[PDB]
Amino acid sequence: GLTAQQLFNCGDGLTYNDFLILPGYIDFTADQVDLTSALTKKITLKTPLVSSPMDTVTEAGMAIAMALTGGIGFIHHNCTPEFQANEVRKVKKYEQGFITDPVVDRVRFEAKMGSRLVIMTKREDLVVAPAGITLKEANEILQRSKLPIVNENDELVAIIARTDLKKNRDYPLASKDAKKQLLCGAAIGTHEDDKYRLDLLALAGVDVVVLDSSQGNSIFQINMIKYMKEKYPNLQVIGGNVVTAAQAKNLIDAGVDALRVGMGCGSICITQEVLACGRPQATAVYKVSEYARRFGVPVIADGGIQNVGHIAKALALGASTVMMGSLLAATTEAPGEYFFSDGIRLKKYRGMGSLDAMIKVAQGVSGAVQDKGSIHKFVPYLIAGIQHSCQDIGAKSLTQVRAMMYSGELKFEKRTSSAQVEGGVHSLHSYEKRLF
Amino acid sequence: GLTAQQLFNCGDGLTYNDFLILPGYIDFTADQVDLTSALTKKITLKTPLVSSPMDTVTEAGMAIAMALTGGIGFIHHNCTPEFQANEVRKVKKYEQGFITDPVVDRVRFEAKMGSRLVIMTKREDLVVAPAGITLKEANEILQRSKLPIVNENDELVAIIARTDLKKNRDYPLASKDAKKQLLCGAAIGTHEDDKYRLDLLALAGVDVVVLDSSQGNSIFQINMIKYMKEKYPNLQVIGGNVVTAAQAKNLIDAGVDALRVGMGCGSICITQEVLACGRPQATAVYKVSEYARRFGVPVIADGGIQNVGHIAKALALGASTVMMGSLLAATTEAPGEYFFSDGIRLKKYRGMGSLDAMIKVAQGVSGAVQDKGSIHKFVPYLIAGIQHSCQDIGAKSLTQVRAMMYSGELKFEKRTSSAQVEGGVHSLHSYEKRLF
Amino acid sequence: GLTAQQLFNCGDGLTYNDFLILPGYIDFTADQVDLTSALTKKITLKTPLVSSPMDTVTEAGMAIAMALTGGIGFIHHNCTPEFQANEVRKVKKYEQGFITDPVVDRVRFEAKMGSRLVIMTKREDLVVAPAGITLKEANEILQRSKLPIVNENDELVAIIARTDLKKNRDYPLASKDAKKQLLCGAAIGTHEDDKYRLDLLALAGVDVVVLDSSQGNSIFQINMIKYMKEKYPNLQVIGGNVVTAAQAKNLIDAGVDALRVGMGCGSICITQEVLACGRPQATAVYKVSEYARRFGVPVIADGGIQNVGHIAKALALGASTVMMGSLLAATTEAPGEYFFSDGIRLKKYRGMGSLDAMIKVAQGVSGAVQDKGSIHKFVPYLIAGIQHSCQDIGAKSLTQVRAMMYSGELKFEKRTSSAQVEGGVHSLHSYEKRLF
Amino acid sequence: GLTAQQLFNCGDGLTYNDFLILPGYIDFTADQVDLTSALTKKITLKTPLVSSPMDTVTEAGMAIAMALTGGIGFIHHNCTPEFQANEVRKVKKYEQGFITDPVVDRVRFEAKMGSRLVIMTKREDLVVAPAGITLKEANEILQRSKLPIVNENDELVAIIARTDLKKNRDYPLASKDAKKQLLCGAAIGTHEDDKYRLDLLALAGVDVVVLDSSQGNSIFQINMIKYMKEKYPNLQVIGGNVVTAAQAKNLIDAGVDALRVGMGCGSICITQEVLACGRPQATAVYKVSEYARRFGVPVIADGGIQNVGHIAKALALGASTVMMGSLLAATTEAPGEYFFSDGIRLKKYRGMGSLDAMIKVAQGVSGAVQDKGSIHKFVPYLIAGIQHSCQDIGAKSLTQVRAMMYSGELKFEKRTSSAQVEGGVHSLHSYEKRLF
C-alpha cells in the first residue's frame, strides 16, 4: 500500500516489472470500462493505443487497421516524401462518407440540375437524398447497394457510396476526423528537408505529426515546433523523445500538443548500452506526465510495452496513450512478408537506428518477431485486457485511474525479483501460453 | 534478527524466497509438534493443508485422500452442478459409521421388531449391539466381518459396516464431520446460477464453500456472501481472493468464516503480467492475517507454494491453512491420466483462467507436472517436513509459531539473491534430489 | 569504505558474494603472512583449514593429509563406532616419534638391560641414543635407516623409527599433539548411543570432538556437552550448528571450546528450502564471532566455501577457522572411487541429510564433483591464496585481519549483481580457468 | 534526477550497468564534441582511449595504430627488456619528420657543404629546403616523392622523407611528441630488475611508463616512483592499480603523474573471486577521481569497459582517460594470430595473472574474443559513439561533462535489474547486432 508519489520518488530507477497495482473494490463489469483517451490536446481516441512510426510496423495497412479498431497509427518517414504522403492519402481516403469531388461525378447514368451524369437513367426513376441529412439517414434511404445527394435546385451536391456506410457501421470505435475519414498521423525529422516532406504530408491530409528523435530536447526541434505551429496553426504536433520534466518544458514552451516519452527502452534499442543515456520507463512516464499534466499536455508512453500489464501500468502512472512497436510488429497489417525459421512464422522487426534501417553509430538492432495475427483481433484483445485491469483496480475509466493515482487512492507495491518470478509462470514441467 | 512487523512493513514487496526464519531453542522432538489448524471459524483440521479447487487437482479422489490424511479438499466447479454435487456425495459417503437409511435395510437375512430383513437368519443366532454405544464399542463387539444396532424394542435403529470401522481405525487424522463422514468443501462462482448449484451442493452435504474469484472484493461476492449466510446460517463460507486488509474488511463485514488470500502467485498464473494487478505472496499473507485475526477470521495462504519451506513460512506469517495446486497436481488422486514425454511421467495441470479451462482474456496457462505419487505418501511427508521446521524455530505447535511471530519473539532475515543461491544446492557437477 | 559493524548491521541478509574487502597498504610480501589459527580454546593449527565430517570427505586419508598440510580433519560418524574409532587410530598412529609400546620390542636383533631383543646383535656394535634427547638429535644420531633409546641402566626405554623422523622433517606445518602424533577430531551425534561411540573414540585418541547437528541449540546437545566436559575434562568440544548469538550463548554456557557456525549454506544443502530455517553465511559468521569472541570461543565458518575468496572473507569477518565439504570432496584423499561421465573425472559428494547418507525428510542432496587432485597440492594452494589476500588487505596475519576489522580499520563495500558479474570473468567468447 | 555525489555516496557498490545519465539540452551537433583528454600531468591526447599493457593486446602494432587514431598504447613487459625496448623503438621510429641521424646520410646521389652524398647528383639540379621551415612548408616544397634540408653554409642539416609527410597528413589526430614521432608508453614491474628494463626503455624513447600491479599501494611501488622521478625528472609515471583515495594519496605523494584505477573488474579477472579484494568500477572511478582531481592527477578508468556506454560513464564520473583490454583484444593490430572455432574467427585474450601469461595463484583466465577488425576502423567508431553520448547529455567536451557532473548539473538514475533488461535488447525472437 504505497502511493505513486511515494513509490517513484525514492530514486530506485524502477520499471514496469518492478511493481504491481493493488486491487480495489469492484462494483461494475469489465465491459463497462471506458478507455477514451487524449492523443493530443485536440485528438481524442476511444482507446489509448498507437502504432509506432517504424519501417516494420506502420504504413497504410497498420494506420488504417489501428484507426478502425479505436487507436491511431504514425507512418514512418524512412521513405520518400512522395511515398509517405501516398501512405497518408491511402489511409485518409479509406473511408469518406460524403464524397464531394466526384459530385458537383462532376456536373457543372444519373440525370441529376447542372449535367450530373452520375445522363441516361433520368432523375425520376432514381432514388435521391436531400442535402443536410446525415449518414444514418443516408444508410436507410437506399437500403441496398450503389446515394446521389441533391441540393435544392436538384443539383448534385454530393454522393455517398454504400461501402462507406458499411465501414462506418462495422467499426463503431473508428478514429475518424470531422469529415468521417480515418484520421492518420505521420512522423518527420527536424532537418530543413522535413519542411518539404511536411508540406506534402499536409496536402495528404495528415492529422497529427510527431517529430522523430531519440533526444528531442534540442534547439533543432524547438525551432521546428515553432515553425509548424506558425505555418500550420491547427496541426497537432507531438514532441520528440523526452524522459524528464526539464526536457518536456522546452518542447511544451515551443508549443507541443502532446509529448512522446521514452528513451532506450524499446525492444530493439541499444541506445542505453551505446550512449549511456536514457531512463527507466515506468519512472520516465510518471515524472513527465506528473509535470506535463499541469499544462494539459498528454504523454505517450513510448517503449518497453511487452504485454497488457505494461499498458495498464503506463496509463495508471500518468500516460494518456501508449505506443508499441514489437507488440504489433508481427501482425498481418504490418509492413513486410512472413517467413519461417524453426517451424515458426516470423515477420521482421528492426529499430530505426539499426544500420539497415539507416561514421554511423547504430542505436537499434534488426530482428524478427513471431506472428501475432490481425490487428483486428489483437487490438480488441488488448482493449479487453486493459478493461479487466481497470476493473480489478476499481476504476471505470482511464480518466478515473489517473485521478485515483494522483489523489493517493491507488496503491502500488514493489516486486522483488523472487516476487517477479512468482508473479509469472513457475514450477511447471512444460506449458503453452495463449491469451485470446 | 528482525521481527515480522519490521520485515513486512518497509514496502520492499517480499515473497517466500526473500527471507528466512532464524532457528531458536529445541527442547522437544519433531514428532511432538502439533499442526491442528482452523480451516474456517468452525472447521478445524489436524493439518493446515488444503487442495485447490481446480480441474486438474480436486475431485472426489483428491478430496477423499486429502481428508483421510488430515487436510481437506475443494471440488472445482468447472463442471455441471449435478457432476459437482455427485463428487461431493461420493466424498461424503466414503465413510459413514452409523448408517441409518439402510436400517429403520428398511424395517417398518437378519430377523430384527418391525420387519428388518437385514427375515431368514433369526434375531437370536445373530450378534447385535445396543443403541447408544460408540464406534469403538461397535468395532470390538463383532470382531470379524459384515453390526445391526437395536433400539429397546429390538427394532433395527441403525447398522455399521465393518469397512467403515476399518477406514476409521486406519486414518487417525481423518477430517470427519459430526456424523463420522469425511468432510468436503466445494468452490462456486458468484453469478445467480451459483445459487442453484449451491442448493445441489447443500443437498450433497458439502461442509464448506469457497466463492471463486481472482478479485473477491466485489459487490457481487459481498451480496452472494450475505445471501448464503441467510439461506444457510450454519454453512461455512470462505471469501474470494484478496490480498489487502481493505478488501478483507468488506468480505469480513459481509460475513465470511475464512479468507482465501492470494493474487497472481499461483504457478500457472499470468494475471500479474496480463492485468498488472496482484501482490507478492509473503507480504499478502502477513498483512491480511495480521488484520483478519482481529476478527477471528482464518486466512488461507493460497498460491506460490512450491515446497515445504513455503508452507512453514505462510503459517509463520499468519496463515491458518495453506492451499496448493501444483504441489498436488501430479499425484495419483488428482484428476487426469498420466502420460510420458522425455521418459518423464506427467499429469496435466492448468490454471482455471486458461483458455482451455475456460473476448476471453486468459489469466492462466496450461501445462504438465511430474508424478508426485500418492497423496497418502506425499501429505504425510509434508506433515513431517512442517513439523521439523517448527522444531528448528522452537515451536511445539502452529498456534505457538504465530504467537512467537506476533510477540516479536520469532526473528527473520532477508535473503539477498546470492544468499538465496547459497541457500539452495550449489557447486555440484551433478546431483539428484529426493525428500521422502 | 564501510566497516563490518556498519555493513552487517543493516538487516540486508548478505553473503560472501555480496561484498568485497577494500585493499590497503602493502609493506611486506605474501610469503610473510601468518595463518596460525585457533581450532578450539586449546587446539591451534598453522592454517585455518578443516575438512568436514561427511561420508564423502573425511576418513583417515583426508584427516591425515589435512593434518600434514597444516589443518585438521573430522571423521564422519555415519559408520560403526568400531570403524570410526579405527579411522581415528589410523590417523593417530600415522606418525609417532618416540614409540613406547614396542620398547620397554618389549624387554622386561639388539641386545639392550632387561632382555630387549630389538638378543643377537649385541649392545656394543649397535648405535644407541640417551633418554632425554629430542627428535632433532635422534635424526642425526643415526643418519641412515632403521634408534633404540636407552635409559641409564642401558635399558630399552623407547625406540624411534627412521620413517617418523622423515614424515616429521617433510611436513613442517604438521598438526601434531604433545606426543608428536597427527592430531585428529571426530564427529558424533547427541543421542545416548553417542556416549559409547565417544568412549571408543576416546580410547582411539581423538583430540577434538564435534557434536553433529543442523540446529545445535537444544537441550539434547547442551546436556551432552555438560556430560563430555565432566567425563572428559580436557577433551575439546565444538558446539552443534548455530547461526545466532542467542544459540551460541547456550552452547557456550554448556561449556563449548569452539562453535561450528553454519545453517543451510553448504553446497549440498536443502534445509533452507525444506525447513525454511537457516541464515545467510557471511552474516552468520560476523554476528556469532563478534559475540563468541567476548568469551574467547573460536568460530568455525562452516558451509558455503566455494573458493579462496570465501575463506578470506570468513576469516576477515571473525571466524578462526573455515570448514569445507565440496572444496575438498573430489581430492585423492577423500572417501570414494573416481569415475567418469562426459569425459569428466568425478568423485561422489553427498549431504549427510540425503536419503542415501541417511518418515525421513531429506535435508541434503547426492551429487558428484570434479577431481581436484591431492590435498597435498590443493591445501598449499589455498594457503598461498589466503596469504595474498591478507597482503592486498594489508594484514601480516589472520589475527591482524580481525583486529583491523574490529577496530574499523578494514573497509568493505557491497557488490550489486552487476558488480558481482563484473568481478568475475565476463565478455569472453571462451576461456579455461586454472589456479595452481 | 540524482547527482553523482548523491548516487555514489550511499554505499550501494554500484557499477556501470547499475546507472544511467539523464539527457539534457542539445544545441550543437555530435561532430562538434571535443574529446581532448589528459593522459598524464603532461601527456595530452585527442581522445581518452588507451590500450592495456597485456600479452594479447599491446605491442608495436597496437601502440602505433592507437597513436595514429588519437589515443596511446602501453607495451606489455611479459617479454625481455630487449624485446620490449625494440617494440618501443619500432613505434617511436614509425613517424619522424625531420630525420637527423641520416643527415649531418652523414656528411661531415646529392652533392650537398661537408660531403653529403645524399655526390653524383650535384647540389644545383636538386631541390632543397631552408632550415627553420616547417613540415607544412616541407610538404609543398617538393610536391612529388623522395627533401634535403640545408643549413646556411649549404650543409646538410636534416632530411624529410615524403612518407612521413604522408603519415602526418593522413592522421590529423596522431598522438605525436615534440619531435613529430608517435608517442609510446610502456609497462614495467617494481622489482629492482625493472630499473634495468626502464633504462632500456628510456634509451628506446618511451614517453610514459606505468608501474604494473594489482595493488599498487605498496612500499615497493612508492620507492620505485621516487626513484624514477629522481633518475628521470621529466618522465611521466602512472601509479599502480588503486581503487580508493587513501591508496591514491600514497602514490600521489610518491609523485605520480596519473593514476591507473581498477581492481578485479577486467573481463579476464578472477582476483575478486580468489583474493576477495577489489572494488566495483563505477564507484572506484568516481571516488578516486574526485580525490585525485584536487591534486591535478588524471585518473585512467582501467577495466570493465565492455562497450561505448561504459567509456562515456567512466569519463562522466571523473576519469580523464579509459583503458581497455577485451574491447581491443581481437583487432588486427593486436598480438597473436586469428583462428576459427564454430565458424567464428577469434584471437586469444588472456589475463596477465593467468598461469599461461605467468605456488602460483592465478588471478587471470585465458580465453578468446571474436574478431573486431582494425583499430583504424574501431577506434573512429568509439570516438563517434562517445561524441553522440556527450551530445545527448548536453556537453560539448569531456572537460564540460566533468564540470556538469561536479557542479551537480549532470543527473543520473539507478537502474533496477528489470530496468537494465529493458535498456538492452528484449522481446525479439532473434536479432543480429552491429554498430559501425
Ligand SMILES: *c1nc2c(ncn2[C@@H]2O[C@H](COP(=O)(O)O)[C@@H](O)[C@H]2O)c(=O)[nH]1
Ligand atoms: C532504440 N529505440 C528505438 C529505435 N527505433 C525505434 N525506437 C523506439 O522504441 C519504440 C518501440 O519499442 P517497443 O518496445 O518495441 O515498443 C519506438 O516507438 C521508438 O521509440 C532504435 O533504433 N533504438
Ligand SMILES: *c1nc2c(ncn2[C@@H]2O[C@H](COP(=O)(O)O)[C@@H](O)[C@H]2O)c(=O)[nH]1
Ligand atoms: C492465476 N491463478 C490461478 C488460476 N487458476 C487458479 N489459480 C490459483 O493459483 C492457486 C494454485 O497455485 P499454485 O502455486 O499452483 O498452488 C489456486 O488455488 C488459485 O488461487 C489462473 O488461471 N491464473
Ligand SMILES: *c1nc2c(ncn2[C@@H]2O[C@H](COP(=O)(O)O)[C@@H](O)[C@H]2O)c(=O)[nH]1
Ligand atoms: C545441509 N547441510 C549439510 C548436509 N550435510 C552436511 N551439511 C553441511 O554443509 C557443510 C559442507 O558444505 P560445503 O559448502 O560443501 O562446504 C558441512 O560441513 C555441513 O555443515 C545436508 O544434508 N544438508
Ligand SMILES: *c1nc2c(ncn2[C@@H]2O[C@H](COP(=O)(O)O)[C@@H](O)[C@H]2O)c(=O)[nH]1
Ligand atoms: C585481473 N585483471 C587483469 C589481469 N591482467 C590484466 N588485468 C586488467 O584488466 C584490464 C583489462 O580488462 P578489460 O575489461 O578487458 O579491459 C587490464 O588493463 C588490467 O587492469 C589478470 O590476470 N587479472
Ligand SMILES: COc1c(C)c2c(c(O)c1C/C=C(\C)CCC(=O)O)C(=O)OC2
Ligand atoms: C529516432 O528513433 C529513435 C527513437 C524514437 C528513440 C531512440 C532511438 O535510438 C531511435 C533511433 C535512433 C536514430 C534513428 C538516430 C537518430 C536520433 O538520434 O534521433 C531511443 O533511444 O529512444 C527513443
Ligand SMILES: COc1c(C)c2c(c(O)c1C/C=C(\C)CCC(=O)O)C(=O)OC2
Ligand atoms: C478464478 O480462479 C482464479 C483465481 C482463484 C485467482 C486468479 C486467477 O487468475 C484465477 C483465474 C481467472 C479466472 C477464472 C477469471 C475469473 C475471475 O476473475 O475470477 C489470480 O490472479 O489470483 C487468484
Ligand SMILES: COc1c(C)c2c(c(O)c1C/C=C(\C)CCC(=O)O)C(=O)OC2
Ligand atoms: C547433521 O548434518 C547437517 C548439518 C551439520 C547442517 C545442516 C544439515 O541439514 C545437516 C544434515 C541433516 C541431518 C543429518 C538431519 C539431522 C540433524 O538435523 O542434525 C544444515 O542445514 O546446516 C548444518
Ligand SMILES: COc1c(C)c2c(c(O)c1C/C=C(\C)CCC(=O)O)C(=O)OC2
Ligand atoms: C598485474 O596485472 C594485473 C592488474 C593490472 C590488475 C589485477 C590483476 O589480477 C593483475 C594480474 C595479476 C598479476 C600479474 C599478479 C601480480 C600483481 O599482483 O601485480 C587486478 O585485480 O586488478 C588490476
Ligand SMILES: [K+]
Ligand atoms: K532497449
Ligand SMILES: [K+]
Ligand atoms: K504466477
Ligand SMILES: [K+]
Ligand atoms: K545450500
Ligand SMILES: [K+]
Ligand atoms: K573480472
